[PDB]
Amino acid sequence: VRKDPITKEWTLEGGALVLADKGVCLIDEFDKMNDQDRTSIHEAMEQQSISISKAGIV
């Protein structure tokens, strides 16, 4: 989520998994990536969905 320069409103931004909605996401050097950065993708890799609750946006 991010704040737009026009009207300062909180709007969503698509991540890497949003751009692979019917495709393949590919991770190189998976072990050396941080645990917070490794395993933030549980809901996309299990529920096939991204549930977001931040900045008044669900």
Next chain:
DNA sequence: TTAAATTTTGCATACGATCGATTAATTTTTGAGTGTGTTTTTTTTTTTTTT
């Protein structure tokens, strides 16, 4: 010595040259009337993301 022909000179007069009085276009102004734009943004605080 005296009378007629002739050409000159003064004067009146009519016609053009030129300035002046008047006057009609014109075109610039004449502000008068009318349409219209206008305050003004402002750091401060929250939340998030990366560092």
